[PDB]
Design an enzyme around this catalytic site. Sequence first.
Site, PDB file in Angstrom:
ATOM      1  N   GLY A  66      38.140 -14.581 -12.889  1.00 41.22           N
ATOM      2  CA  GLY A  66      37.894 -14.936 -11.462  1.00 41.22           C
ATOM      3  C   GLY A  66      37.131 -16.239 -11.084  1.00 41.22           C
ATOM      4  N   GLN A  73     -13.381  -6.528  10.388  1.00 38.45           N
ATOM      5  CA  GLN A  73     -13.748  -5.100  10.454  1.00 38.45           C
ATOM      6  C   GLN A  73     -14.780  -4.665   9.412  1.00 38.45           C
ATOM      7  O   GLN A  73     -14.833  -5.167   8.286  1.00 38.45           O
ATOM      8  CB  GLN A  73     -12.533  -4.150  10.265  1.00 38.45           C
ATOM      9  N   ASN A 127      30.709 -15.913  -7.748  1.00 35.47           N
ATOM     10  CA  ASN A 127      30.989 -16.356  -9.133  1.00 35.47           C
ATOM     11  C   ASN A 127      30.022 -17.271  -9.832  1.00 35.47           C
ATOM     12  O   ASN A 127      29.559 -18.285  -9.263  1.00 35.47           O
ATOM     13  CB  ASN A 127      32.455 -16.851  -9.242  1.00 35.47           C
ATOM     14  N   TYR A 157      26.197 -18.624 -19.456  1.00 38.81           N
ATOM     15  CA  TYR A 157      26.891 -19.294 -18.367  1.00 38.81           C
ATOM     16  C   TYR A 157      25.980 -20.385 -17.757  1.00 38.81           C
ATOM     17  O   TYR A 157      26.501 -21.423 -17.274  1.00 38.81           O
ATOM     18  CB  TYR A 157      27.287 -18.347 -17.226  1.00 38.81           C
TER      19      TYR A 157
HETATM   20  C1  F43 Z   1      -8.308  -7.515  14.643  1.00 39.58           C
HETATM   21  C2  F43 Z   1      -7.581  -6.186  14.868  1.00 39.58           C
HETATM   22  C3  F43 Z   1      -6.407  -6.353  15.868  1.00 39.58           C
HETATM   23  C4  F43 Z   1      -5.204  -6.239  14.917  1.00 39.58           C
HETATM   24  O1  F43 Z   1      -4.087  -6.604  15.207  1.00 39.58           O
HETATM   25  N1  F43 Z   1      -5.566  -5.725  13.728  1.00 39.58           N
HETATM   26  C5  F43 Z   1      -6.979  -5.546  13.617  1.00 39.58           C
HETATM   27  C6  F43 Z   1      -7.521  -6.116  12.275  1.00 39.58           C
HETATM   28  C7  F43 Z   1      -6.576  -5.670  11.122  1.00 39.58           C
HETATM   29  C8  F43 Z   1      -6.972  -6.224   9.696  1.00 39.58           C
HETATM   30  C9  F43 Z   1      -8.507  -6.245   9.452  1.00 39.58           C
HETATM   31  C10 F43 Z   1      -8.996  -6.969   8.141  1.00 39.58           C
HETATM   32  C11 F43 Z   1     -10.109  -7.925   8.393  1.00 39.58           C
HETATM   33  O2  F43 Z   1     -11.160  -7.414   8.796  1.00 39.58           O
HETATM   34  O3  F43 Z   1      -9.991  -9.171   8.225  1.00 39.58           O
HETATM   35  C12 F43 Z   1      -6.180  -5.222   8.758  1.00 39.58           C
HETATM   36  C13 F43 Z   1      -6.805  -4.878   7.393  1.00 39.58           C
HETATM   37  C14 F43 Z   1      -4.710  -5.704   8.637  1.00 39.58           C
HETATM   38  C15 F43 Z   1      -4.587  -6.998   7.790  1.00 39.58           C
HETATM   39  N2  F43 Z   1      -4.408  -8.144   8.439  1.00 39.58           N
HETATM   40  O4  F43 Z   1      -4.671  -6.942   6.541  1.00 39.58           O
HETATM   41  C16 F43 Z   1      -6.210  -3.984   9.656  1.00 39.58           C
HETATM   42  N3  F43 Z   1      -6.559  -4.195  10.855  1.00 39.58           N
HETATM   43 NI1  F43 Z   1      -7.247  -2.639  12.125  1.00 39.58          NI
HETATM   44  N4  F43 Z   1      -7.467  -1.353  10.570  1.00 39.58           N
HETATM   45  C17 F43 Z   1      -7.937  -0.133  10.516  1.00 39.58           C
HETATM   46  C18 F43 Z   1      -8.323   0.740  11.671  1.00 39.58           C
HETATM   47  C19 F43 Z   1      -8.542   0.099  12.875  1.00 39.58           C
HETATM   48  C20 F43 Z   1      -9.331   0.765  13.960  1.00 39.58           C
HETATM   49  C21 F43 Z   1     -10.811   0.838  13.436  1.00 39.58           C
HETATM   50  C22 F43 Z   1     -11.605   1.695  14.464  1.00 39.58           C
HETATM   51  C23 F43 Z   1     -13.086   1.806  13.982  1.00 39.58           C
HETATM   52  O5  F43 Z   1     -13.806   2.579  14.610  1.00 39.58           O
HETATM   53  O6  F43 Z   1     -13.548   1.199  12.958  1.00 39.58           O
HETATM   54  C24 F43 Z   1      -9.153  -0.176  15.162  1.00 39.58           C
HETATM   55  C25 F43 Z   1      -8.059   0.450  16.095  1.00 39.58           C
HETATM   56  C26 F43 Z   1      -8.726   1.617  16.817  1.00 39.58           C
HETATM   57  O7  F43 Z   1      -9.761   1.431  17.512  1.00 39.58           O
HETATM   58  O8  F43 Z   1      -8.230   2.762  16.726  1.00 39.58           O
HETATM   59  C27 F43 Z   1      -8.582  -1.403  14.487  1.00 39.58           C
HETATM   60  C28 F43 Z   1      -8.610  -2.584  15.115  1.00 39.58           C
HETATM   61  C29 F43 Z   1      -8.130  -3.928  14.684  1.00 39.58           C
HETATM   62  N5  F43 Z   1      -7.368  -4.096  13.638  1.00 39.58           N
HETATM   63  C30 F43 Z   1      -8.570  -5.165  15.407  1.00 39.58           C
HETATM   64  C31 F43 Z   1     -10.080  -5.533  15.012  1.00 39.58           C
HETATM   65  C32 F43 Z   1     -11.087  -4.437  15.341  1.00 39.58           C
HETATM   66  C33 F43 Z   1     -12.487  -5.013  15.300  1.00 39.58           C
HETATM   67  O9  F43 Z   1     -12.645  -6.120  15.895  1.00 39.58           O
HETATM   68  O10 F43 Z   1     -13.319  -4.358  14.647  1.00 39.58           O
HETATM   69  N6  F43 Z   1      -8.149  -1.138  13.246  1.00 39.58           N
HETATM   70  C34 F43 Z   1      -8.548   2.145  11.363  1.00 39.58           C
HETATM   71  O11 F43 Z   1      -8.665   3.007  12.263  1.00 39.58           O
HETATM   72  C35 F43 Z   1      -8.618   2.706   9.959  1.00 39.58           C
HETATM   73  C36 F43 Z   1      -7.856   1.901   8.863  1.00 39.58           C
HETATM   74  C37 F43 Z   1      -8.093   0.395   9.107  1.00 39.58           C
HETATM   75  C38 F43 Z   1      -7.122  -0.531   8.351  1.00 39.58           C
HETATM   76  C39 F43 Z   1      -7.610  -0.800   6.899  1.00 39.58           C
HETATM   77  C40 F43 Z   1      -7.291   0.330   5.954  1.00 39.58           C
HETATM   78  O12 F43 Z   1      -6.384   1.118   6.229  1.00 39.58           O
HETATM   79  O13 F43 Z   1      -7.951   0.416   4.867  1.00 39.58           O
HETATM   80  C41 F43 Z   1      -7.256  -1.842   9.153  1.00 39.58           C
HETATM   81  C42 F43 Z   1      -5.946  -2.550   9.156  1.00 39.58           C
HETATM   82  O1  LIG Z   2      -6.324  -3.023  17.036  1.00 40.34           O
HETATM   83  S1  LIG Z   2      -4.893  -2.554  16.880  1.00 40.34           S
HETATM   84  O2  LIG Z   2      -4.665  -1.260  17.390  1.00 40.34           O
HETATM   85  O3  LIG Z   2      -4.073  -3.615  17.622  1.00 40.34           O
HETATM   86  C1  LIG Z   2      -4.540  -2.759  15.242  1.00 40.34           C
HETATM   87  C2  LIG Z   2      -5.154  -1.636  14.421  1.00 40.34           C
HETATM   88  S2  LIG Z   2      -4.994  -1.881  12.584  1.00 40.34           S
HETATM   89  O1  LIG Z   3      36.886 -11.032 -18.365  1.00 38.61           O
HETATM   90  S1  LIG Z   3      36.337 -11.399 -17.056  1.00 38.61           S
HETATM   91  O2  LIG Z   3      36.811 -12.614 -16.538  1.00 38.61           O
HETATM   92  O3  LIG Z   3      36.834 -10.282 -16.089  1.00 38.61           O
HETATM   93  C1  LIG Z   3      34.646 -11.298 -17.015  1.00 38.61           C
HETATM   94  C2  LIG Z   3      33.970 -12.589 -17.501  1.00 38.61           C
HETATM   95  S2  LIG Z   3      32.136 -12.356 -17.792  1.00 38.61           S
END
Ligand code: F43
Ligand SMILES: O=S(=O)(O)CCS
Ligand SMILES: O=S(=O)(O)CCS
Lengths: 110, 442, 548, 548, 248
Positions: free
Chosen positions: D444, D146, D480, D332
Amino acid sequence: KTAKVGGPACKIMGRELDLDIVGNAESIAAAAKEMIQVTEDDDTNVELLGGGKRALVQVPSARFDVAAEYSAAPLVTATAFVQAIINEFDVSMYDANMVKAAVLGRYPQS
Amino acid sequence: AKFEDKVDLYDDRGNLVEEQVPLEALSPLRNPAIKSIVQGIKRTVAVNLEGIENALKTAKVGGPACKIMGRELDLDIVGNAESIAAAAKEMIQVTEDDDTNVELLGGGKRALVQVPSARFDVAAEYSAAPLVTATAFVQAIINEFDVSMYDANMVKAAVLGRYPQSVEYMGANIATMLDIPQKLEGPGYALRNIMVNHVVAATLKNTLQAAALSTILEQTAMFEMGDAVGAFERMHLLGLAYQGMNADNLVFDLVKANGKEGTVGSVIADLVERALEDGVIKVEKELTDYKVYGTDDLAMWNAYAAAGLMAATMVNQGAARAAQGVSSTLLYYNDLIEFETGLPSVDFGKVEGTAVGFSFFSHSIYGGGGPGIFNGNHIVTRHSKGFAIPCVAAAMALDAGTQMFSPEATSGLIKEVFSQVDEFREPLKYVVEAAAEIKNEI
Amino acid sequence: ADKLFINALKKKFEESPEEKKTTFYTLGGWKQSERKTEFVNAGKEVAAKRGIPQYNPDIGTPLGQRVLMPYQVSTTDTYVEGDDLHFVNNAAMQQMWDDIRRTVIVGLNHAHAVIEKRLGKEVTPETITHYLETVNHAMPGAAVVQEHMVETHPALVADSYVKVFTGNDEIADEIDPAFVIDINKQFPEDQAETLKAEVGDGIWQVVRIPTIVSRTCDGATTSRWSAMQIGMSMISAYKQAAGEAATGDFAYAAKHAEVIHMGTYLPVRRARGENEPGGVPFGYLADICQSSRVNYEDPVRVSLDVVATGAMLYDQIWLGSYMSGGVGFTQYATAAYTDNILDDFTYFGKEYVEDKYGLCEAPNNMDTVLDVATEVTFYGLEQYEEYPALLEDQFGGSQRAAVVAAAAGCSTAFATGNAQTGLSGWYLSMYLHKEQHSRLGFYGYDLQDQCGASNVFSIRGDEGLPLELRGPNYPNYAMNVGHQGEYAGISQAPHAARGDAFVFNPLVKIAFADDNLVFDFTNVRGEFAKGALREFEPAGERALITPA
Amino acid sequence: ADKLFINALKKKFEESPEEKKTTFYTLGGWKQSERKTEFVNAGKEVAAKRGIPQYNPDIGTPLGQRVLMPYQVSTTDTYVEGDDLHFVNNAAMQQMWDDIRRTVIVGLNHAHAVIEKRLGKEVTPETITHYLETVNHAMPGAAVVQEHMVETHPALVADSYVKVFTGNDEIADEIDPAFVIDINKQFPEDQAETLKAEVGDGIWQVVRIPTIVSRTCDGATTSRWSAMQIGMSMISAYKQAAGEAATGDFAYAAKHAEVIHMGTYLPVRRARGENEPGGVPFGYLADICQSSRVNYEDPVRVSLDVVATGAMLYDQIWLGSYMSGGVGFTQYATAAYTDNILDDFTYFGKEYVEDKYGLCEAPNNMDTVLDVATEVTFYGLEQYEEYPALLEDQFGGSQRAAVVAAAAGCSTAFATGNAQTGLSGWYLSMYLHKEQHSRLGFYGYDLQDQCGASNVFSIRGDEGLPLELRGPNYPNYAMNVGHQGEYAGISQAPHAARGDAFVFNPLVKIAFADDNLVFDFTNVRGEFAKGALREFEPAGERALITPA
Amino acid sequence: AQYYPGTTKVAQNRRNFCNPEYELEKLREISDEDVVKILGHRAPGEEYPSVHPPLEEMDEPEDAIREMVEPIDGAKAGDRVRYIQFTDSMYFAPAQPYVRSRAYLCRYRGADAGTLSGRQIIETRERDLEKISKELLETEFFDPARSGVRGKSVHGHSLRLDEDGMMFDMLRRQIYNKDTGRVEMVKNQIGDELDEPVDLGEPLDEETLMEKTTIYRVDGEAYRDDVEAVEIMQRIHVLRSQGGFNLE
Ligand code: F43
Ligand SMILES: O=S(=O)(O)CCS
Ligand SMILES: O=S(=O)(O)CCS
Ligand SMILES: C[C@@H](OP(=O)(O)O)[C@H](NC(=O)CCCCCCCS)C(=O)O
Ligand SMILES: [Mg+2]
Ligand SMILES: [Mg+2]
Ligand SMILES: [Mg+2]
Ligand SMILES: [Mg+2]
Ligand SMILES: [Zn+2]
């Protein structure tokens, strides 16, 4: 009445609901029994104690025959009483979650 | 009966079986075939006798890659399986000719074990099945060969693995469709912690039966959880009937109409047409070139909507013969139907939400995996209360081999043993017959 | 006046913030940035030292084809590149978590009754003070009874101690004031009267174990460690036999019967003991933040300081490390506490409500949810449309969804004085946003957002709960970024508008009103800025016992 | 020659070791001790700086009415006061636990199959090398895909990396050797051949996440952190879409299907996630310790290096902090790795067995148990009787029971080559001991020891398990001190005598044969000494990001 | 089917993308070979790799659902599953993420669609992917300045445009030629250089983007002014809320 729900020393100011549950225990226990039982003549038991302060509930054996374990007892009883209370006082959608917190506590966060 | 509803029941080829059965004859609380399936899943254990023998001969016990050099024991377990199975049965049974079953499979390499129900009627839960079966096979093997006091703890490790140092039976050579009670996401979840691949293995990849078994298990859990109590009971029963049991042949007929050329979108249009036809929805308000639909029966609209969702999965994932798109169907069938109608989608948005997390956790780095490793106890897929997982079972049944973590990969032992049990393998058959049999007692 | 985020946008970009176009690709990639330059140099030194390749800007795709932005920490004039707000690189963020993880509240009420009813001994403010001298020696890891005990180095454990509080003014006056969290001094008069009434004549300890131990071990260590040393200090200060039957009553009381953990334990898929972030409910996180007792005249400032606390903890440390890890989730969280953006949107909504209804005067119903959450949602979304620099700043849809929904939810709760209708406004905001821009968050963003409406007012077993009781283990919430810290803000919002001294637990509120904490919980965003500038001094370091 | 503990006794006391009388009360209390004196001064400075009393030597009873002893770290010439062996004061001990906690083993066998069969791309040693360069950039917390990612400071996370190993020498030799744990280089020829036969064509990653993260978070973070960055590195190195369906197989493989945790999760009373000390079975702890590949000529040295590893981890950090806390359980544990005392008893037993049976040549039965455990138990107890200085050193009965029974159990297993009969000899030792001196351990101490005979050879559900598979969660052992690290040595004992390359898991054995670890697992007692001298440099520190 | 409420051009455009009876405006011609190149899954002249045997060499037992659902041609053949992913600018790209997923599941069979803010993706059997991708690329789903084919490093949906009106691309897969006013695809969607670039035509002018866009904005048509569409969204929120509480 005090909004003290969810565990030791917990309170939500502004959520207090004053409901006369014990005064209406007979009606509430019957309404709960209808939800807890499977049929009218089964082994479900719901009995008021302590002048309506407590209820003894025995959940019908039939529910356990088609259950993996035993949690149907608290969960079926809890929900039957939550629903019986809401229905008794027409508790609103906005407020009913307080009755659920008073009856079952902080579950499922705990 | 508590409710007025009746349904028509059909077989897996879409032919009428029984007209106008009261809805509650399909209730987990009343239906004896659902009872038999639950009790069966509780008490059935697959024993890997070849696995035990190989573990002992190599000293490989206690989990992946583990071995204790110098502990090897070379015992002819498979050659003597008849005598060992007979000795274990004698321990497992309560009395002669009770419902205890022990049957050798694969020429003595596997054993199907059904622990007697009387053990469970004086038990809090279901762990007596693996625990009684493990100990009876451990003792039967020790006795067979006169294994000494010094060596016998190796037979125990070979059978039940690293328990009790691990919480689970880590490395065990017995298997069950349930998992241990400590792994439940919440109380009452045990019938939900059953892998989709296990269900599909047990039903031999037959799509309707996989959907039926899955729905039966999920909705029976909603009774144990208390979700199907009181205000919500009828919603749950109607979902069972219409999404899982092909009530009124609705799922079947939508698949038939859309199987040739159809898409999720064409399925939605057909379902909305059928709900209006049957009176389940009606036009409430006209906006500009847009009809707002209403219903006086949300549990019924939900059920119809749920039948369409299962039909849409069967059409979409069936056309691909690839299960992965079920997460997309579960999302966009619901998102599309809301804007198409102005009415809430299946389970009031909970299927759509499940599907959003399930899409993400089946295409991302953070967890989940392929559709077959999910179940209703999984954190990603527990949110809809029975209306999402049976579609995943249907999709996986339809997969022609696009998965690395397929039923063949994760569920071989379960398939060989549990597919043997009629009511597990063909539950749509037995549940319908049982409903017909009790129809005038509800 | 300028929108509150204008100064920040003027500092990040050459363009005025309304301008629609810019220049890319010619900034030199990572070379534009002081911090990436620092990291490329450090990776070359790390790899050569250890004989294994490490950080290398030529692996994968080349960062910095656009401007790598500075961020203003909201409410401050501090501007830093985002790496400086990553929890690994920011010691104030780590110490914030350590101060919560290593704290437990343990009552003296059952203890004092064992002393009178079972042992027949007396309890007084003098006996309490003597006990408190004792426990403040013992708690950091030093001995009071046995011969030939070895002990922890007092300077390594300088951050560990035990204070008490109580609603009874005259008792609090009679205990030595070095040990007392003084409710009259730390809270304004109104809030103090509320909190003293909650506590009554109960007496509570606030126990902090050493940061070094919390780091070596885990959160579930905190209440056990606390109970061992309360136990030894009870033996010593009250002259009991050193291990008799009654000793077990004090163990049981301090470990189970009068303990308040900060977090409850988690289920096996996410198995964790007590005092881990997933176990802290949103109402406690709102109470741990101390903005309420300083900024009470500005309910927006109080709510948004809570949002900062929860966004960092729940998204960066909890979801972005305990539940995942790697580069992680810094900016999913910084969106909620940088550039004054959430502030601008939330002051707008507060002004809206104050003008139309009056704070807390709106009916507590769906008509209020529709009115307020919609107006505030449209306001926020309009700013991203009107200032292309703002849209490029909060570039991920998830960030914008959380910020806009947080302003809508908090504003709704400002109107109704109830968190649950605030929460319904949050979900409505998401649905509006999704239709407005035909996108919302990341692939799995709105799992809970689509369950959301239906579960706000449910009463069923694992669905129904008032928002203040929900937390990161509420099932729909257990997986995804961009929600939990904002929910802690909406929990705070009605209480702040009402001027309530606490949201969910008055004991947790008092327990962090303490300037002997290492982190200053009255000024969470200022502390994050201090850590970002490498100016914050954490506890728990091993420098005293390692070579020069 | 002298008994091995004579030198140490002569260093600790002015009297000869056999003398029954001494002088008490005239030593000046704490003033006798350089360390106590450093702590009293530190206590004063801490209290004055923070305004709350802290360490004070006048609280409770006055330490040092007897001689406050130095302890020799066994196999070394280092003598320190016991406070320098408390885990809080000893950075080597903290790092040993962080290096275990932050490691996970992750196969590449299912992954490579997803690449070939599902993506249809080839795997070769060159594609594996390109993948390893990528994951060594990403694993510490840096970006590969990201735009606008913020990242960890490479110098803060310099201890995190990924290496691989495989049983196929030709494949091992084609992968870049910066990334390869070379089995032929690290193990003697016969052990190498065993380990290579076990691994075969399998290829496995050893992943170490940053110690700063492990300390901020918990053990259950390790496998998730490893998996996220293995997943990003698969995406990058093999050029896949960044988040498609197949990505999920890599997640499920790295997190579950081919992961080896160091510790399994714990039940709710002691709720903890994976990679906590209670989940590490005794045979894995014996395999983590690397004394087996260096000291293989001397089965006593290998077995008692495992004892030192386990007594420190399981009694000091685990039972003495995670499960209790405070001053805790330093001594202990130190009874088992100081003053050469366990060494003296264990070499006696090894010689007895050599002469009567030959190593591994005794029948594996109860006659051998009765013979060897009774003789060695009588030998060790005779030493406390013969040398009053030895009895005054190991002053607690538990300490003595653990040491005497460890020599008896290890010696029994040297005879039989089977750990199970070693374990029966451990319990018999306890029974003989309790009768000989009419005392055994603390209140104990012998819960597991009275269950112990009947459960050695049981086969029932939560009773029967070979000793290698038992650990701190085996029910009888869950509470214990003075047992868990000794049982790790007994599990090592028959394997050391047999010359086996590993005790329970060959992958865990190879995974710690790595000089890029911060702690040196080939010489645990040497490293404990280096930490006690304040000469160990741990990883994880925040100096780079805090004020000069 | 009615698809979507609302009285703006934006609402009509959303309906049109979903409606399979609506003929998507074709804006540019792209050869088969060039669609395959842009996808980057296989070489020109390379045979479709297989993930499982063909269906007919399987002889699978009886199943009434399977019998009734016609597999797509790629499924018969055992094709790998492959993907195409697009990013759309918030500055008035014609298609947008939910618009795409909603439209794909109405128009296409056997489709696994995902929506995210910064990318939108579909996966399906190889040969069928190729035919769909050709339509996704030649029609008004795509503008070569405001939309981008990107299987990784997708940043750009929410960024300011460059001086050419092109969306940002970290990997610059799509290059505007200042002398000719046409855009060329120089890399495939995963970012690898193409032997010969693929012409994608001229960007849409400002007035045609405004005509075709499916995003609501204050400087185009604002959603708050599409009061009937807002009404339905609020309705669904209210009906979900009441339904989850007591099924009323
Ligand atoms: C790989 C995933 C799938 C998943 O399970 N988690 C990911 C990635 C994961 C990684 C990204 C770190 C890295 O880059 O290596 C971390 C930091 C979690 C971790 N493993 O530590 C994270 N997301 Ni995600 N993730 C975030 C967010 C988001 C938003 C980002 C949207 C945009 O427009 O940039 C979108 C979800 C959405 O569309 O709503 C999102 C997706 C995704 N999130 C897509 C990757 C998106 C991409 O390919 O760019 N996160 C956020 O919306 C804000 C906070 C942000 C988190 C980091 C922080 O809080 O500082 C991070 C939270
Ligand atoms: O891309 S996902 O919505 O699955 C994870 C966001 S941190
Ligand atoms: O005296 S007691 O056996 O109850 C506690 C030992 S540390
Ligand atoms: C889901 C389950 O993972 P499993 O399926 O058990 O391997 C769980 N992981 C998560 O919930 C990840 C949450 C934080 C990363 C994603 C944030 C959104 S960008 C777990 O690790 O127990
Ligand atoms: Mg028909
Ligand atoms: Mg039709
Ligand atoms: Mg400060
Ligand atoms: Mg053409
Ligand atoms: Zn830690």
